[PDB]
Amino acid sequence: SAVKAARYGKDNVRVYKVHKDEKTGVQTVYEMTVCVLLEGEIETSYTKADNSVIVATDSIKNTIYITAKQNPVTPPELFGSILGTHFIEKYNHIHAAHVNIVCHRWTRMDIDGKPHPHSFIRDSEEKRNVQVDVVEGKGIDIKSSLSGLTVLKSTNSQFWGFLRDEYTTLKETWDRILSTDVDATWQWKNFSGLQEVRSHVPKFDATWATAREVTLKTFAEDNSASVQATMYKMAEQILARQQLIETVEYSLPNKHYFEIDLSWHKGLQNTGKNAEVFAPQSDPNGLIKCTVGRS
Amino acid sequence: SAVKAARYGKDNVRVYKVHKDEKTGVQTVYEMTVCVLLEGEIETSYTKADNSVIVATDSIKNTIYITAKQNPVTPPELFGSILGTHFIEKYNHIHAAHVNIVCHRWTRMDIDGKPHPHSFIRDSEEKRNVQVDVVEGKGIDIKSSLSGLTVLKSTNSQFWGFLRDEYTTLKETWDRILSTDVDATWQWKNFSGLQEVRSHVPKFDATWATAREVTLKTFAEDNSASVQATMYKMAEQILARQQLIETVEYSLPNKHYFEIDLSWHKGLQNTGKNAEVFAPQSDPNGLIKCTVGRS
Amino acid sequence: SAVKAARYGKDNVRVYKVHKDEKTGVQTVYEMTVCVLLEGEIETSYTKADNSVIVATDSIKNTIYITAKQNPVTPPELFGSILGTHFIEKYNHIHAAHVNIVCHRWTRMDIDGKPHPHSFIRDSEEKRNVQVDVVEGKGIDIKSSLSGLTVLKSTNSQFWGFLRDEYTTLKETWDRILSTDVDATWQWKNFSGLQEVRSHVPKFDATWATAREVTLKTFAEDNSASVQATMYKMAEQILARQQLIETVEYSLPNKHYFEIDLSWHKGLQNTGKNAEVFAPQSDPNGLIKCTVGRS
Amino acid sequence: SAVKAARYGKDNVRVYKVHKDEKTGVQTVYEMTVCVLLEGEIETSYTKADNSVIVATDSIKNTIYITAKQNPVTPPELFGSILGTHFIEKYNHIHAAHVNIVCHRWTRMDIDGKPHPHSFIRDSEEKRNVQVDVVEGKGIDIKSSLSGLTVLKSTNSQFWGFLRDEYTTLKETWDRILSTDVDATWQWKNFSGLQEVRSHVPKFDATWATAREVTLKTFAEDNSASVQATMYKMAEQILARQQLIETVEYSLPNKHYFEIDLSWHKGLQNTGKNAEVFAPQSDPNGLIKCTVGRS
Ligand SMILES: O=C1NC(=O)NC(C(=O)O)N1
Ligand SMILES: O=C1NC(=O)NC(C(=O)O)N1
Ligand SMILES: O=C1NC(=O)NC(C(=O)O)N1
Ligand SMILES: O=C1NC(=O)NC(C(=O)O)N1
The missing domain is CATH 3.10.270.10 (Urate Oxidase;)
Structure with a gap:
């Protein structure tokens, strides 16, 4: 028997980020659920118990929070491309990153006919998603959806x-x-x-x-x-x-x-x-x- | 042993009603989920297998659709009061009706800045509910909620x-x-x-x-x-x-x-x-x- | 206006506990979801912003883990009674504790017709629950259910x-x-x-x-x-x-x-x-x- | 623009079947959820409003019940192959059928240490599934899963x-x-x-x-x-x-x-x-x- 395909990573990573305009006092929030799965030269972790080739899924989780701290999280197509590119550049033996992002609605409230600076409502369960596949030597393929x-x-x-x-x-x-x-x-x-x-x-x-x-x-x-x-x-x-x-x-x-x-x-x-x-x-x-x- | 309390009925009855204004051509839809539970002199159905005192739950389901056909379904406090009153007036041995209604949002769409006559969107999962308890000789108690x-x-x-x-x-x-x-x-x-x-x-x-x-x-x-x-x-x-x-x-x-x-x-x-x-x-x-x- | 009733606490606290028999090497696991709500002389937290009377819900969460560490968690009727009694004895101004516990199934696996010492299967979503109300001066009322x-x-x-x-x-x-x-x-x-x-x-x-x-x-x-x-x-x-x-x-x-x-x-x-x-x-x-x- | 791919059909069709052994009086039940999607020469239904090429999804639903009445529903790999083959043989312009079946557990109850003839319990939410793709001229591909x-x-x-x-x-x-x-x-x-x-x-x-x-x-x-x-x-x-x-x-x-x-x-x-x-x-x-x- 042989490994024909393998991918692994972290799913259901909830992330919230707030942007605060010091000038206006207006705050804007973003909340998403992210999944990142990696592929590459990792077969031996499955066949020989060789964990040396494994970036622990806990570390993938950390990387998502660090990436969101250092980069814009919108539009999600950009954030997903940055996050997936990070893995293939950082780890020589990882050759593809698959990032799926689900964006949750937090719509600014209107109170007294005026937009509130820091209060939001979840208006429906409609999502905006992206799937970004970053594959070494083959660019970035992005599927966007609602x-x-x-x-x-x-x-x-x-x-x-x-x-x-x-x-x-x-x-x-x-x-x-x-x-x-x-x-x-x-x-x-x-x-x-x-x-x-x-x-x-x-x-x-x-x-x-x-x-x-x-x-x-x-x-x-x-x-x-x-x-x-x-x-x-x-x-x-x-x-x-x-x-x-x-x-x-x-x-x-x-x-x-x-x-x-x-x-x-x-x-x-x-x-x-x-x-x-x-x-x-x-x-x-x-x-x-x-x-x-x-x- | 004795029956200390008993209630029975039909739950999860989904109902949609449309109102059509022949003058304007404007249509308005209402969609709810209804539960009706009855109480009364029904102990023998439990203790002696006497089904003669039971209004079948299937019949309760029929009654909800017939009631919605013949009466306004809004505001839900009124519809619930009409529906519960029906059971206590119709059946001599039924002395209380408990009606719970969950109203689902179907908000008219705005297309090109104008309200559409017959297209709607579910904007969030927020509900408007009522609980109506109609008890013979004790009036009607209504709890409304969001x-x-x-x-x-x-x-x-x-x-x-x-x-x-x-x-x-x-x-x-x-x-x-x-x-x-x-x-x-x-x-x-x-x-x-x-x-x-x-x-x-x-x-x-x-x-x-x-x-x-x-x-x-x-x-x-x-x-x-x-x-x-x-x-x-x-x-x-x-x-x-x-x-x-x-x-x-x-x-x-x-x-x-x-x-x-x-x-x-x-x-x-x-x-x-x-x-x-x-x-x-x-x-x-x-x-x-x-x-x-x-x- | 006045406060007619008030209760507050922590819900959805997931807890797992393992018991290890050093003699036999057999391990037994328990997993539950706990909710604890308190009542007492806390009206001023609502009416005057007086947080001095509030045991923070985060602290209630800590107390549940500490209680599970120091006491048996089975049968759940006992654990719930211990947990609720703790609050009314520890805090002079808290007069009732309401504890709800949902027990999840982890059934020992049989491998080769023999019970495994430390492997378990979730056989169905059936739950065993308790509701325990501990009220100062009125004892302990327990409702058990499946x-x-x-x-x-x-x-x-x-x-x-x-x-x-x-x-x-x-x-x-x-x-x-x-x-x-x-x-x-x-x-x-x-x-x-x-x-x-x-x-x-x-x-x-x-x-x-x-x-x-x-x-x-x-x-x-x-x-x-x-x-x-x-x-x-x-x-x-x-x-x-x-x-x-x-x-x-x-x-x-x-x-x-x-x-x-x-x-x-x-x-x-x-x-x-x-x-x-x-x-x-x-x-x-x-x-x-x-x-x-x-x- | 052109249609690159298209498939359509009926999802979430719940089906129960009982087998009654007249000799022993033993009854055995099967309950599944079925989805069937068809492909073929149906592009004009999308591009020209030509419904003449469409087997209505309601008819697909009927076909599933009729097929379950006339054939064994177990093992699901066989039932799925029969159901998918039916569409490609019956309709000249349909060239592929994709059938997904989820089997729900109804495990015979043991009462007093003996198997009951007609009473069952849902022991966990574990499923047994099949995906069967029947493609004209390319045989039958079956993926089975738990x-x-x-x-x-x-x-x-x-x-x-x-x-x-x-x-x-x-x-x-x-x-x-x-x-x-x-x-x-x-x-x-x-x-x-x-x-x-x-x-x-x-x-x-x-x-x-x-x-x-x-x-x-x-x-x-x-x-x-x-x-x-x-x-x-x-x-x-x-x-x-x-x-x-x-x-x-x-x-x-x-x-x-x-x-x-x-x-x-x-x-x-x-x-x-x-x-x-x-x-x-x-x-x-x-x-x-x-x-x-x-x-
Ligand atoms: O890749 C991983 N495999 C595992 O078995 N565990 C982890 C982990 O993150 O704990 N990660
Ligand atoms: O009250 C009822 N009891 C039952 O056992 N069945 C029905 C029914 O409506 O089928 N109704
Ligand atoms: O009782 C509480 N009220 C609050 O508003 N916050 C907390 C908390 O635990 O954070 N607890
Ligand atoms: O293929 C179909 N397309 C539709 O728009 N409606 C149906 C139907 O079954 O009602 N079927």
């Missing part, structure tokens, strides 16, 4: 004209509720190294904002023919707006809300045009994915 | 002057991070029945809004001496603003964010006035409660 | 003869699946103090074992007429077997498994006597409770 | 001799607690089709049992030099025992239990050889992976 964005539209979703055979009971519809949790990922062109990532810093937050805006507007305005059709429209637009993105991937559940026939009770009408009360279904759910790239 | 409101302030929290003895290691501080998930409950004066609850309908949403506003403003502006002191200030204010509330209860965790001493590494300064990077602690957490009433 | 015991029987559950009216659609049945998560609590006679709790030490583990055994056997062997009827039989038996218990409370969900009519597809028969494939329902669920005491 | 197996050993784990540099604070140790949740996956040789999968049916349950047994025994008996070294020993053994497995992958967290220095309190000794009480850490955690194949 996830946990839960939306619902109560009309302007249709689903008819699908294949009907002996396994089909679903009735065609011209008006249904559509609700989903959006997971959208945009993969950047490969970067040659940290200098190149730094040169594009401003594009990261701007592209995240565009991705979010396009997702929301398209969902709200599309008279959806299917989840498939609506998600493709979102992906098309993001690619058109940022040339440095190579592909856009969406993964969307179709969280069903079923009509409830109440006609058995005093002829109450609650279906079709008269539907008012519905039963949200926790499971099962449709799951629709697609990856869109350039012609 | 929960899952997660906030953080990065300065203007202190904690010094506490008791120090041989179990104490905590250092006094004049500047710490304070973060908590707010659970606040306001208990209304007992109502004589549905007519009285209807007469106060407008106060329910208004009191929820006030409770939320006071909580946020007080948290943001108080130079907190302890969690105890800050929560009492919130409760005082809510009682002063709504005479029909008898008591206000707060339950607040103190979610710790620890300094990280990095001085072992090249003398890096990250404590006290130089603290920038902190380690959020998932557990343990302080838990502070209080119930405030009128003198 | 929770998270999930079972299913595939036949020998019936439900017919219930009330039928215009809200009823449920068909009577003489053969259904019954599945539930058992939460069972037995409340002990009030104890005068620690000496009395110590005198009954052996009864705690034995009563937990009996409660579990009776629950499982009754569930398995009863040709259930309803969840109500089956749970009463369990409670009756536990009360008959331990005179020092005053009441037994059960809270049971009825987790539904629905038949699936497949007759639309090539006349497939999957209902009634031919039912083989069912759809487990995540929600809603029945919730049935009862508290049984002595005549 | 996950959620949580274990702890209180001694006989060491960690010393690792790399020490300016980022290192971890002290070397010759005696620490090791606790992890085991995720182990064995990938079978590619099968040419359903006939070949059927020919190896008996090997599936046997290989799962061996994988579990080897994992537990190795964890219990290895005087572990690191998580890396111990996991490699497990993987080596599984490969040696089943020739039809090509690779074995393990992913193990290192869930830390920290010593608590109590010497500040009356010189209490709770570290090193005197450590009895430890603080389990919820996060961060080490995460160690490896994939082992044949020389």
